[PDB]
Structure 1
Amino acid sequence: SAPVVGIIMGSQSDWETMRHADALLTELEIPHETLIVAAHRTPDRLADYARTAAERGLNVIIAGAGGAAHLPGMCAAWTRLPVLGVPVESRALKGMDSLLSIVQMPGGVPVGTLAIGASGAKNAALLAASILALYNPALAARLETWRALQTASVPNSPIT
């Protein structure tokens, strides 16, 4: 019932990307919350969200942002929980600004960063699942089944 993963993003425009994280957590039956938290437009909301996350029972935060993408890193500054960052693709620089803004954190405050775009959102959810599976045997079984099906679904040759 109570959420164990928080998915956060700075804008509705980020949802086109972050929806892939939401869908995968739901597929794996991982209770979660999905919210908008804007690092620059709602910085006090961010501080409160991140600093209370652990006491609220969250175990992992998945944060997506694009451009000068500060949401994952500032989240990580305020929580001891693992924070996973999804670089959202930007218009001009194709997410390279997003990527460098998120992955290049200073020693002492980590953000586990995934690929630019939808792939990264899906993989943030899978990485969160991998973390939770360490201490949830039922989920561990669901995740192993999921990975096995992924492997079995790969064809032997292309449709030419």
Structure 2
Amino acid sequence: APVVGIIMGSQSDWETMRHADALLTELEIPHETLIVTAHRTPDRLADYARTAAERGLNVIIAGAGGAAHLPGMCAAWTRLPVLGVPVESRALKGMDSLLSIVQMPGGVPVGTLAIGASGAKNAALLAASILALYNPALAARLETWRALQTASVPNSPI
């Protein structure tokens, strides 16, 4: 049963959000990966977010670009931690994505990651760090992952 949900507004976002999916798979974290759009399927979004906790989800990772409302509206309907990935937009390079996700008024948080692929990977890692607080086997796998990241850095450029 999934403990993280990865959701995104459209197929075009998958180029970005696949990096989150891959990282959860590497760390062997059960998850579901779905399309949910705030603007085109608002009722789907409401149902998804409001039932997330009772379905056993622990963390939601949401990616969107442009006027990016998916993470914020997800957080409006759930008490679960919601992590937001600004997807790079064509004209404004994800600056619109970033501001529309991170600038949540007080009371309804979205933990926001970097624009683009880096943010998708880091949303998965941040989700893993949250789950590791109460899953010792995963905490060990995450320690190994971070140790390998550090150890594998070369000493000089090629």
> What range is the shorter-chain TM-score in?
over 0.9
Report % sequence identity: 99
Q: Work out the number of aligned pairs and report it.
A: 158
Q: Give the gaps of 5 or more residues in structure 2.
A: none
> Secondary structure at the residue paired with 1:156?
coil
CA distance in 2, matches of 1:105, 1:73: 7
> Secondary structure at the residue paired with 1:24?
helix
CA distance in 1, matches of 2:59, 2:91: 31
> Secondary structure at the residue paired with 1:84?
strand
CA distance in 2, matches of 1:38, 1:75: 10
| Number of the residue aligned with 1:66 | 65
> Secondary structure at the residue paired with 2:63?
strand
CA distance in 2, matches of 1:91, 1:3: 32
Which whole-Å deviations, capped at 9, do the CAs of 1:72-91 have from their partners, x for residues lacking one? 00000000000000000000
Q: CA shift at 1:35, angstroms?
A: 0.3
Q: CA shift at 1:56, angstroms?
A: 0.1
Q: CA shift at 1:65, angstroms?
A: 0.0
| TM-score scaled by length of structure 1 | 0.99
Q: Give the gaps of 5 or more residues in structure 1.
A: none
CA distance in 2, matches of 1:29, 1:67: 31
Aligned-residue RMSD, C-alpha: 0.2
Q: CA shift at 1:158, angstroms?
A: 0.8
| TM-score scaled by length of structure 2 | 1.00
Q: CA shift at 1:157, angstroms?
A: 0.8
CA distance in 2, matches of 1:78, 1:153: 41
CA distance in 1, matches of 2:29, 2:21: 10
